[PDB]
Symmetry: D2
Subunit: 328 residues, 4 copies
């Protein structure tokens, strides 16, 4: 099923408690959503499906190019599909900068607030505010008001302090975050801190995350080994095993996956076109071969390949076999 | 917007009155739905989007393979998208044989009956019962009870008498159809008659349709030039202009398109893979090129190409520039 | 075997007498020479293999780029191969303009004159002087001295009056040609006249050739139906059957083929690369498949395909089954 | 130029004296010969071009399939080309087993004996007798009579003791070889011994070669560090640097290269077909693009790429910059 707000909070709390994380898979379409959920289900895992600003725009079609429309359309599709699987699937929106808040996150929050007001659950279970391009104080002022709106709609907020590529987060940056937002008692939030992490597969310092947890623990009057933050790891695709393991130990509960699942989705499509070149093209006066230019023929292979890569992510992040539905 | 039942009936009545038809485009995904609606909008035309049994199964994903789930999921997606376009888009389900009625058309009718009972509109605006593999009397017995259910849910039924490939419909076959179902007063229906028409692009007798109209007119006590039937043309892709024109004159209001839009969708994907071969594949120890293995890069080209082919269909069937919303 | 000068003259005389022609296939390599000779042999036909200036340069390799070297190297190769076939193969050089005479045709003539002086046969059996870019009088002055040199080396000269693309040859142009060169008694020559013919496959006037024959016959005091000229048809690839037939009737004895055999050679290579994409490329960390990146694997397919196209040319030009060796 | 027998012997003697080796490149065509010689010339190196039984058969064309014909045809071509380069190029025939001696090596030896009898040089400068499938005594009996014939025709014989894949050569095997053939005083020979070496790129014991040299030195009454054998390294493509270096130290003077140059030749052809897919194929009723289906367009890229790989071989084997013509 779609993760209820209660289930999603429990997912993240269990991940943190047990030092594992969920892959958050960027999707752009019915096929990619289907591949992701099938991957989670094959791994006996709960998981997160996220739509970026560009993914949402693509989802809305070339005739619309509207982020809210695309996100809502894909979310409505995902609600129907996820009801047929025995794992929990949470819906999330990815990086939204300041000048897109009024055209992405805010209208989506408003839609969910309306659902909640009528006794329903929110359409998305988390939204990202990406304030890494603005000064920390401005970032956290926006985060504070968004956290209030988000919590009131039963939604978890993801925020980012410092910049993802494609200087590190200071102890004071971590300190300000705890001071402005608390440690979950004013609403759950996820924190993307910057520790040398980059988008795309081509100098990670996971110790920055360990430092953030210690700085927060000291601020809160907690034991030295406490982990007050739930961290998000941006630029997950292409990471070393030892680096992932360290990140998990320091409280990463969500790792974003996009590049690696894109390659997995495209790879069998390329193979299909090449081996069926004279079927997918009308060559030498012939009319091609409908059975191989039927989009389903190669898109089913793309779906299966992407699902395999998602299963790998679940095993790498150690959430495989741990779905809170306990289908074994 | 999505066509209301009232708008859809008006679409078909206007098409018939003015000797034009709508393309009914088989879709299987968010991308293909988006391409189809953009095509209708670019042509200033209303249109129909249809899901086959196989398309619905594909839409539900490899982990589900459930026709109802896929149709509902894609219909919910389409409802969100179509609200953003200034043309009317009707949703239809394609060929459902006897042994799939209980797992496709009937549950979908039930969903729409529930919506209507609550003061809403049906999820789909038409459903096809394909009884061409059973004897005419059995076909029409099923059609009669389905027409009653369909009309009660504000849904148009499509039926088929005789077999589409990939012998012709007799005057008595046409006669039995009028006798069992009437001429619309017991609920609107669309009729696929068989006149030498075949699925897939590789002996049409459109005069069979003219004969059916005359046989029905005589039965009903109408003038010789009356056209009591609203016909559906199966195997639209790859047809001659002169054959389409004749079909339109005899009351074809809906022409099914699948093969031709499949080729249009796939063609730029193939081109993409070939010209970006060393970007979509990791070759010679290199890591490929994310900007070209990102599915959006080639799927946007696929969408645009499919939309162009849909525009061509609207111009071929003469529904281009005739949307009942009159945006000019 | 390689055509002796005596056999070559007999080939052309028989072609003219019986209204057929030989394909003259542009070759650039051991593979293309092999494909051409196999094509002639499969068709039971004699044939011509020709090297262009660019083909000769390519034959000499990127480290040499010398037309004489490439032509000699490929001619020496062809001499060895043709000795193993029961058809006659003549070697020819294609379009040589004025500023390349001193670096192609003249040195090659000199090589053959040396062979003949020692009691041997010439290396090539014909050479083309292409003077179509210079005024007719200058063209024919050069042709006259080259014809003397060529005849002394037992070599047939091909000349061109008027320009091949990618205005027509006048009666006076034809008249001047007979006046300057005679009708074979001062050495055999072949004549490329311009009648709307073009290089490459994308307004032919074969009657220009009929007119030339009549003009020459009148000059020579011959009957009206005499054909004093042996014509060459440039731009043979992609020609209509009716146009070829007419050309043959008017004394075309040689039709140049390049574009069509190039496509035939390349087509299975392309097919090979696509269907073996993951064998001819090292993909995803794999090491490819030696059996399909071995050049012989696809070059044998290229050879066979080119040979098939040459067989087609022999049947189109009606020289198939007419080899002067009479192997039946 | 082509290596004279005197120059070839000097090449191998200098290689041995200075612990370097020549690549021996398998060629099958005018293009591959041209690529190889250009590679040697670009590296300022002398080199060897070899034709296998299969390469020779391919060289003769599908209509002939005769090893002698193909080898002679390609050798005659190579003689013309090599005269235009300022490095020495030796011609060699590769693996000939017992049942092919009468149809490859022996007739070729006979051709060269005829040339030598008339005061000329042999057509090939070395021939391989591959007796690795027969018992050592039989191997060496054949080798002894072939060495006599070869030396009389000014030709170096290559022999093989033990089997190349795709057990090691014993001290007695090495001993028998010296006893039967001497150490060059009865004619120069090259020795392929088996030390865990395999054809094709996917447990080398170079110390077997060191052992052979010591065993031979002891037999001959020479100092312990003497290297009486000139070794040949079969399966050169895909070898480690450290393994090549060791082999050179123990007297390898010739390293066979085939797989690696095949990949280099094919790789840009594949790239060409993919990026020009709609030019090399007639697609969607179009007629393709002659400039890219012209075989020269991609074969020039193949030639250049293969030449680059040959340059790499010359640098790996340390013969680069050491041509005995001393063009610097
Ligand atoms: Na990354
Ligand atoms: Na059709
Ligand atoms: Na042409
Ligand atoms: Na090897
Ligand atoms: Zn990110
Ligand atoms: Zn459990
Ligand atoms: Zn149909
Ligand atoms: Zn209007
Ligand atoms: Zn020409
Ligand atoms: Zn005969
Ligand atoms: Zn070998
Ligand atoms: Zn030097």
């Amino acid at each position: 099923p779609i993760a209820t707000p209660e289930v999603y909070a429990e997912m993240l709390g269990q991940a943190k408690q047990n030092s594992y994380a969920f892959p958050a898979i960027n999707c752009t379409s019915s096929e990619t959503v289907n591949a992701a959920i099938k991957g989670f289900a094959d791994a006996g895992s709960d998981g997160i499906i996220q739509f970026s600003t560009g993914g949402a725009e693509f989802g809305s079609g070339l005739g619309v190019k509207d982020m809210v429309t695309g996100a809502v359309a894909l979310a409505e599709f995902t609600h129907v599909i996820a009801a047929k699987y025995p794992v929990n699937v949470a819906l999330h929106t990815d990086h939204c900068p300041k000048d897109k808040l009024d055209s992405y996150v805010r209208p989506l929050l408003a839609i969910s607030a309306q659902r909640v007001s009528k006794g329903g659950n929110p359409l998305f279970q988390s939204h990202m505010w990406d304030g890494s391009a603005v000064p920390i104080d401005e970032n956290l002022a926006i985060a504070q008001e968004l956290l209030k709106a988000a919590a009131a709609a039963k939604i978890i907020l993801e925020i980012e302090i410092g910049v993802v590529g494609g200087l590190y987060t200071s102890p004071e940056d971590f300190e300000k975050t705890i001071e402005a937002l608390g440690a979950g008692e004013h609403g759950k939030y996820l924190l993307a801190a910057t520790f040398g992490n980059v988008h795309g597969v081509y100098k990670l310092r996971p110790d920055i995350l360990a430092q953030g947890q210690q700085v927060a623990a000291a601020k809160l009057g907690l034991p030295a080994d406490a982990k007050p933050f739930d961290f998000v790891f941006h630029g997950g695709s292409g990471s070393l095993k030892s680096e992932i393991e360290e990140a998990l130990r320091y409280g990463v509960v969500k790792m974003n996956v996009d590049t690696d699942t894109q390659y997995a989705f495209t790879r069998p499509i390329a193979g299909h076109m090449f081996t069926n070149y004279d079927g997918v093209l009308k060559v030498d006066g012939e009319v091609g071969v409908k059975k191989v230019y039927d989009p389903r023929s190669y898109l089913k292979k793309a779906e299966a390949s992407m699902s395999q890569r998602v299963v790998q992510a679940c095993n790498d992040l150690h959430c495989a076999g741990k779905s809170l539905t306990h289908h074994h």
